[PDB]
Coordinates of C-alpha atoms in Angstrom, one line a residue:
Chain A
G1 CA 4.1 -45.4 -6.0
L2 CA 1.9 -44.5 -3.0
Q3 CA 3.9 -47.1 -0.9
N4 CA 7.0 -45.6 -2.6
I5 CA 6.0 -42.1 -1.5
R6 CA 6.4 -43.3 2.2
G7 CA 9.9 -44.8 1.6
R8 CA 11.0 -41.8 -0.5
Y9 CA 9.7 -39.4 2.2
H10 CA 12.1 -41.2 4.6
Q11 CA 14.7 -41.1 1.8
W12 CA 14.4 -37.3 1.8
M13 CA 14.3 -37.4 5.6
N14 CA 17.7 -39.2 5.6
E15 CA 18.8 -36.7 2.9
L16 CA 17.8 -33.8 5.2
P17 CA 20.9 -34.4 7.5
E18 CA 23.1 -35.2 4.5
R19 CA 21.9 -32.1 2.6
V20 CA 22.2 -30.1 5.9
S21 CA 25.8 -31.4 6.2
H22 CA 26.5 -30.2 2.6
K23 CA 24.8 -26.9 3.5
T24 CA 27.1 -26.3 6.5
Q25 CA 30.1 -27.1 4.2
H26 CA 28.6 -24.5 1.8
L27 CA 27.9 -22.2 4.8
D28 CA 31.7 -22.2 5.3
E29 CA 32.3 -22.2 1.5
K30 CA 30.2 -19.0 1.0
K31 CA 32.0 -17.5 4.1
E32 CA 35.2 -18.7 2.4
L33 CA 34.2 -15.7 0.2
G34 CA 31.9 -13.6 2.5
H35 CA 33.9 -10.4 2.5
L36 CA 33.9 -7.1 0.7
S37 CA 33.5 -3.5 1.9
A38 CA 32.6 -3.2 5.6
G39 CA 31.0 0.2 5.5
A40 CA 29.0 -0.8 2.5
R41 CA 28.3 -4.3 3.9
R42 CA 26.8 -2.6 6.9
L43 CA 24.7 -0.5 4.5
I44 CA 23.6 -3.6 2.5
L45 CA 22.7 -5.9 5.6
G46 CA 21.3 -2.6 7.1
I47 CA 19.6 -2.1 3.7
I48 CA 18.0 -5.5 4.1
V49 CA 17.0 -4.4 7.7
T50 CA 15.1 -1.3 6.5
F51 CA 13.2 -2.6 3.4
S52 CA 12.2 -5.8 5.3
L53 CA 11.0 -3.8 8.4
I54 CA 8.9 -1.6 6.0
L55 CA 7.3 -4.7 4.4
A56 CA 6.7 -6.1 8.0
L57 CA 5.1 -2.8 9.0
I58 CA 2.7 -2.9 6.0
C59 CA 1.8 -6.5 6.8
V60 CA 1.1 -5.5 10.5
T61 CA -0.9 -2.3 9.7
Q62 CA -2.9 -3.3 6.5
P63 CA -6.7 -3.1 7.1
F64 CA -8.5 -6.0 5.4
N65 CA -12.1 -7.0 4.8
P66 CA -13.2 -10.3 6.4
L67 CA -12.6 -12.3 3.1
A68 CA -9.1 -10.7 2.4
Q69 CA -8.2 -11.3 6.1
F70 CA -9.3 -15.0 5.8
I71 CA -7.2 -15.5 2.5
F72 CA -4.2 -13.7 4.1
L73 CA -4.6 -15.9 7.3
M74 CA -4.8 -19.2 5.3
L75 CA -1.7 -18.2 3.2
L76 CA 0.4 -17.3 6.3
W77 CA -0.7 -20.5 8.0
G78 CA 0.2 -22.5 4.8
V79 CA 3.7 -20.9 4.9
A80 CA 4.1 -21.7 8.6
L81 CA 3.2 -25.4 7.9
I82 CA 5.7 -25.6 5.0
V83 CA 8.5 -23.9 7.1
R84 CA 7.8 -26.1 10.2
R85 CA 8.7 -29.3 8.1
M86 CA 12.1 -27.8 7.3
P87 CA 14.9 -29.0 9.7
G88 CA 17.5 -26.8 11.3
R89 CA 17.8 -23.4 13.1
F90 CA 16.9 -21.3 10.1
Chain B
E1 CA -32.7 16.7 4.5
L2 CA -33.7 13.7 2.4
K3 CA -37.4 14.3 2.8
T4 CA -38.7 17.1 0.4
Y5 CA -41.8 17.3 2.6
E6 CA -42.6 16.8 6.3
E7 CA -45.2 14.0 6.0
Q8 CA -42.8 11.6 4.2
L9 CA -41.7 9.8 7.4
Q10 CA -45.1 9.1 8.9
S11 CA -48.0 6.8 7.8
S12 CA -51.4 6.4 9.5
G13 CA -54.1 3.9 8.6
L14 CA -55.4 0.4 9.0
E15 CA -52.4 -0.9 6.9
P16 CA -49.5 1.5 7.0
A17 CA -47.8 2.2 3.7
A18 CA -44.1 1.6 3.1
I19 CA -41.9 4.6 4.1
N20 CA -39.5 5.3 1.2
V21 CA -36.6 7.8 1.5
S22 CA -34.6 8.4 -1.7
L23 CA -31.0 9.5 -2.0
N24 CA -28.3 9.8 -4.6
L25 CA -24.6 9.4 -3.6
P26 CA -21.5 10.5 -5.6
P27 CA -19.9 7.7 -7.5
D28 CA -16.8 7.5 -5.3
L29 CA -17.6 5.0 -2.5
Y30 CA -15.5 2.2 -4.0
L31 CA -15.9 -1.4 -2.9
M32 CA -13.3 -4.1 -1.9
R33 CA -13.1 -2.6 1.6
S34 CA -16.7 -2.8 3.0
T35 CA -16.1 -0.3 5.8
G36 CA -19.8 -0.2 6.6
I37 CA -22.7 2.3 6.4
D38 CA -24.4 2.0 9.8
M39 CA -27.8 3.4 8.9
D40 CA -29.1 4.2 12.4
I41 CA -32.9 4.1 12.7
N42 CA -34.6 5.3 15.8
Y43 CA -38.2 4.5 15.0
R44 CA -41.5 4.6 17.0
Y45 CA -44.8 3.0 16.3
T46 CA -48.1 1.7 17.8
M47 CA -47.4 -1.3 19.9
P48 CA -49.6 -4.3 19.0
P49 CA -51.7 -5.6 21.9
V50 CA -50.4 -9.2 21.7

């Protein structure tokens, strides 16, 4: 099992390109439907822009005590380490 | 203002007694932030020889 972990890690590593290739097919597949109401679409992608910028502004401005700041740091660092292992431009 | 008499903040003797200043605060200074209460103390005393 422990030895299997190594081989399966490589198995998933090999799957990364395979799954990525499937994702690109799906990228086009979702685009093969990605259309609706342009004025509204601009509102909705623009709606993403405003809510996410508000959340980012709260994350930037929030005062924390040393313990809450340490917990927040460790969680953001954990997220960065997970995301760094993911392949691709995203 | 937290004295109630002038000689509260001074003690003279061979062994100086503890200087105690009492205060009661409104129950509104909530925790979980720890902003800090910098109790500045500018004190003066007799300097020991050695």
